[PDB]
mmCIF file of C-alpha atoms in Angstrom:
data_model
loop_
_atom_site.group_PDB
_atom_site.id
_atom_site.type_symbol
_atom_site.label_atom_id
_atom_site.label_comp_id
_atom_site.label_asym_id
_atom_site.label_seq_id
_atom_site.Cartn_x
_atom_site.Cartn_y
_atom_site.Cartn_z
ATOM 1 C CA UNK A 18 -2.949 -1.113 20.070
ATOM 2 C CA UNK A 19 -2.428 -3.286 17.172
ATOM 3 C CA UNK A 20 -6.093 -5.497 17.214
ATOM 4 C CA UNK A 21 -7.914 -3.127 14.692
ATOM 5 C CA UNK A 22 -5.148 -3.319 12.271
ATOM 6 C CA UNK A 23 -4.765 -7.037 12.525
ATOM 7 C CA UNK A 24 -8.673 -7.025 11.757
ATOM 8 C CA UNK A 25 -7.938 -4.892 8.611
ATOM 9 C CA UNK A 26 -5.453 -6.801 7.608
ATOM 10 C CA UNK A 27 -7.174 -10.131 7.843
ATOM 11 C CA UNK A 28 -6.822 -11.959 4.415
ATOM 12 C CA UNK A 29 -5.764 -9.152 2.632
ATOM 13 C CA UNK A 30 -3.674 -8.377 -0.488
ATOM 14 C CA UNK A 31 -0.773 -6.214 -0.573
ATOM 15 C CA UNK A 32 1.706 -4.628 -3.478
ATOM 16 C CA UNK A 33 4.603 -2.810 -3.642
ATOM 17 C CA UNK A 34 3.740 0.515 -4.814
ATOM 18 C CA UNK A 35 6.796 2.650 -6.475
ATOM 19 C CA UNK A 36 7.103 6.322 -6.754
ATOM 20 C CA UNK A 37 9.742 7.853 -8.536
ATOM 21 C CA UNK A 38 9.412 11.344 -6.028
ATOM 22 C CA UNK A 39 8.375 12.020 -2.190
ATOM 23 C CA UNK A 40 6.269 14.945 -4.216
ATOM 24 C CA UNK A 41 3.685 11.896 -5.602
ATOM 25 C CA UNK A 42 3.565 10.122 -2.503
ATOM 26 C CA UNK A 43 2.640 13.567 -0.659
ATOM 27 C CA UNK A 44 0.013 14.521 -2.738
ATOM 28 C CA UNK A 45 -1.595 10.781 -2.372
ATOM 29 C CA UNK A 46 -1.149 11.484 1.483
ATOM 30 C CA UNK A 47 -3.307 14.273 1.021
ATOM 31 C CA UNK A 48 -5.970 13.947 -1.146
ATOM 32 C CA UNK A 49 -6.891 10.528 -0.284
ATOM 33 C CA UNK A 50 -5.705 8.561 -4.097
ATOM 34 C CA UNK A 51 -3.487 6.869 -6.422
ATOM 35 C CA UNK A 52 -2.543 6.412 -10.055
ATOM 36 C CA UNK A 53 -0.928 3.595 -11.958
ATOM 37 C CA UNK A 54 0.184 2.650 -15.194
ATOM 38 C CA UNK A 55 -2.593 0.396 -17.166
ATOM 39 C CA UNK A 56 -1.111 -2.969 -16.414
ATOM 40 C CA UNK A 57 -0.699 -2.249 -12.928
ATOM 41 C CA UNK A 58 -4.340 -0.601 -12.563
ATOM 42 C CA UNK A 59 -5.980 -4.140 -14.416
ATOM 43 C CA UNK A 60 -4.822 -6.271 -10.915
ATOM 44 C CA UNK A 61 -5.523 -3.635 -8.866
ATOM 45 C CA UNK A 62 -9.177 -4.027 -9.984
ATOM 46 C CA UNK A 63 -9.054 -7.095 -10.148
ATOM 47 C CA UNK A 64 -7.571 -7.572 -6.475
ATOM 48 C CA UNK A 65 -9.953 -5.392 -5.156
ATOM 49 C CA UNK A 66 -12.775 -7.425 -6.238
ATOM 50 C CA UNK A 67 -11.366 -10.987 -4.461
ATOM 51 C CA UNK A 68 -10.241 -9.484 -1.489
ATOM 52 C CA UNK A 69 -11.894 -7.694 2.007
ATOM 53 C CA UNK A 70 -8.723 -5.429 1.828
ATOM 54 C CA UNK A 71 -5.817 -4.440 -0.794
ATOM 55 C CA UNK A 72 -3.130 -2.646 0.889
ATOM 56 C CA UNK A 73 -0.771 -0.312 -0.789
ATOM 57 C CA UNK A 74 3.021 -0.102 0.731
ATOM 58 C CA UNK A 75 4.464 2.921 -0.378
ATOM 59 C CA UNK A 76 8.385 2.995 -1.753
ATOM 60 C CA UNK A 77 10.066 6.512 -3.005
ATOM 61 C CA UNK A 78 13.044 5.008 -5.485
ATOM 62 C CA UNK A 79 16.510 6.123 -3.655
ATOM 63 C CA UNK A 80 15.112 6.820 -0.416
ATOM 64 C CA UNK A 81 15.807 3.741 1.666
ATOM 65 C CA UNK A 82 12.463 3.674 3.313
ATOM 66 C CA UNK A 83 8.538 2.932 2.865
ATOM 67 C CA UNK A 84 6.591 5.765 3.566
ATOM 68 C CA UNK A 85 3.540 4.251 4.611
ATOM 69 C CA UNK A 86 0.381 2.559 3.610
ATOM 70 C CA UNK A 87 -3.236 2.392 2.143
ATOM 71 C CA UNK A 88 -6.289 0.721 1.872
ATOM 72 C CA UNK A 89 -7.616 1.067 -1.845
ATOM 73 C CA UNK A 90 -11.725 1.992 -1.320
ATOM 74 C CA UNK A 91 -12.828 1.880 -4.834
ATOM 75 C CA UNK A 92 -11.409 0.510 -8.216
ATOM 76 C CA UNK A 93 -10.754 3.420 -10.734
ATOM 77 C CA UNK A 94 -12.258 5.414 -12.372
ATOM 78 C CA UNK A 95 -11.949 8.423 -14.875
ATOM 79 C CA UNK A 97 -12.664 13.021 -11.804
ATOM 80 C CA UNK A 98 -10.589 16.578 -10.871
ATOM 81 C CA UNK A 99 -7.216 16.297 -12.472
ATOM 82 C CA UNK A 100 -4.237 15.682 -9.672
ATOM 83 C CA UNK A 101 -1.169 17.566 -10.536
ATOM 84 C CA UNK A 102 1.480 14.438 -10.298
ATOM 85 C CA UNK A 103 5.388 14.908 -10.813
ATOM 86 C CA UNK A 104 5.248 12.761 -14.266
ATOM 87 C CA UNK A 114 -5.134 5.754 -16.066
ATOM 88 C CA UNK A 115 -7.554 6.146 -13.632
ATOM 89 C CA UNK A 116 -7.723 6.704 -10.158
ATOM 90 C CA UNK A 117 -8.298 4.867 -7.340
ATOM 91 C CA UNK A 118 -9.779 6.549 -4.048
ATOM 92 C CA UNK A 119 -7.399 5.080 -1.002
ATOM 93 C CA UNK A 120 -7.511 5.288 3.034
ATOM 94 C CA UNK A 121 -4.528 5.350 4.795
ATOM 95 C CA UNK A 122 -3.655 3.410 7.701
ATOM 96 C CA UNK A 123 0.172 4.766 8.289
ATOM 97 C CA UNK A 124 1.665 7.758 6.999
ATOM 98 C CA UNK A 125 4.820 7.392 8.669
ATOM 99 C CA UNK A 126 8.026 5.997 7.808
ATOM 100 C CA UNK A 127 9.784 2.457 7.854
ATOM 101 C CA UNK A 128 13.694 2.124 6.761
ATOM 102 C CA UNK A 129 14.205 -0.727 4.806
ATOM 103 C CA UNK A 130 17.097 -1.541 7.254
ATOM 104 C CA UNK A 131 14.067 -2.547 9.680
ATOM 105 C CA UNK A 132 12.525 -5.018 7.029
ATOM 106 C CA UNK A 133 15.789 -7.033 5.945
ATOM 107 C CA UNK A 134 14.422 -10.487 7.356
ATOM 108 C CA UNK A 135 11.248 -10.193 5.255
ATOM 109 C CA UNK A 136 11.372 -11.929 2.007
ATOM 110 C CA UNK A 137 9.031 -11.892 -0.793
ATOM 111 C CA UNK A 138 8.017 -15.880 -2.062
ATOM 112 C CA UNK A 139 6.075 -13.921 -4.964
ATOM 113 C CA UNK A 140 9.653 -11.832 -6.237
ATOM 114 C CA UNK A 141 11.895 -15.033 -5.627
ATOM 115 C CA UNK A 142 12.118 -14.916 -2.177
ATOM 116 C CA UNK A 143 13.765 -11.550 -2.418
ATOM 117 C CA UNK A 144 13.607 -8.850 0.364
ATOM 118 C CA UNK A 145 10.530 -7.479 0.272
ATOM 119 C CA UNK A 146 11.608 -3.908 -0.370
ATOM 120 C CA UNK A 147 13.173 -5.533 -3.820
ATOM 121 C CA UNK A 148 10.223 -4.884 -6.701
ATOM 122 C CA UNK A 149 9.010 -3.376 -9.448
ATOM 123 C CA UNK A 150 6.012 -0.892 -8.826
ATOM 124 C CA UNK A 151 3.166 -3.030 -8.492
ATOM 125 C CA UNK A 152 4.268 -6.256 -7.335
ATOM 126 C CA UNK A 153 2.515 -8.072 -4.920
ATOM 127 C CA UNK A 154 3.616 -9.138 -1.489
ATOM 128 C CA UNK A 155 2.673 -12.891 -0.368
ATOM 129 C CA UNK A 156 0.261 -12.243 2.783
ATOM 130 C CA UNK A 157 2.599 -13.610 5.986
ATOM 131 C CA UNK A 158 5.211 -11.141 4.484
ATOM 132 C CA UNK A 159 2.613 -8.519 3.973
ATOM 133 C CA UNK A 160 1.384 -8.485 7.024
ATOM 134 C CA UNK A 161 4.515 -8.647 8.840
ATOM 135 C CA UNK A 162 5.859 -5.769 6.785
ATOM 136 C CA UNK A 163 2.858 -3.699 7.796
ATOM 137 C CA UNK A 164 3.008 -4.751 11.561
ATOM 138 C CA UNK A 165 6.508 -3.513 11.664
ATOM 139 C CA UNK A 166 5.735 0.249 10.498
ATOM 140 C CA UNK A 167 5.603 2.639 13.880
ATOM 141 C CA UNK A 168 1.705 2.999 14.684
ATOM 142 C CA UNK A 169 0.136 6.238 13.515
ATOM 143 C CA UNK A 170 -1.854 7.841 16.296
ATOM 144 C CA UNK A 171 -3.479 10.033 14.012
ATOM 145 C CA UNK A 172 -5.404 7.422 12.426
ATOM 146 C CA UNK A 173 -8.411 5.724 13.779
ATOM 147 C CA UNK A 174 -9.493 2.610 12.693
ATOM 148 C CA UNK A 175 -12.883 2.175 13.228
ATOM 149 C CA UNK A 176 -13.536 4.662 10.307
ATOM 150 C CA UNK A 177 -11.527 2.321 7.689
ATOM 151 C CA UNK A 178 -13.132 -0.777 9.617
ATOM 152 C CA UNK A 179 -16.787 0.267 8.313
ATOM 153 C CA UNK A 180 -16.057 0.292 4.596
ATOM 154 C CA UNK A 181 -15.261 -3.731 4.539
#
């Protein structure tokens, strides 16, 4: 069902996150976290403190698609060095690691990026909530996942 995710997502915050390889975005599928550049990691932190959730919509640059999405669980911090494909580093959860074509999202626009669609965006910009949400409702669910365990954390 959908009920635990709309609970998750319940007043939450949401940014585009940009990865210039599917390499990056595998290795933050695995090991459970993220890295930014500075500016990006200062409203991260900051989000995370003003919000119950801060969701993470994952983009790889050429690929036509999002490839999932995150819950952040901690602001960063500075831990065993992660091998990316070139500041801190946030711990994340994922709700959805599968895939959503950006064909699927066309009637979702951005008020926060001029109204653009919301797969238009530089890394780190954030998505309004109704078109957050909506964007994350749309992804196929991920059986793999449960809930409850991401649930406990707010």
């Amino acid at each position: 069902g959908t009920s635990k995710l709309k609970y998750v997502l319940q007043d939450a915050r949401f940014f585009l996150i940009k990865s210039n390889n599917h390499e990056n975005v595998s290795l933050a599928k695995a090991k459970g976290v993220w890295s930014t550049l500075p500016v990006n990691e200062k409203k991260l932190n900051l989000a995370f403190r003003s919000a119950r959730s801060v969701i993470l919509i994952f983009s790889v640059r050429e690929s036509g698609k999002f490839q999932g999405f995150a819950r952040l669980s901690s602001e960063s911090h500075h831990g065993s060095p992660i091998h990316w494909v070139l500041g801190g580093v946030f711990k994340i959860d994922w709700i959805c690691r599968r895939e959503l074509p950006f064909t699927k999202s066309a009637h979702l626009t951005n008020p926060w990026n001029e109204h653009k669609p919301v797969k238009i965006g530089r890394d780190g910009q954030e998505i309004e909530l109704e078109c957050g949400t909506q964007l994350c409702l749309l992804f196929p669910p991920d059986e793999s996942i449960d809930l409850y365990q991401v649930i406990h954390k707010m």
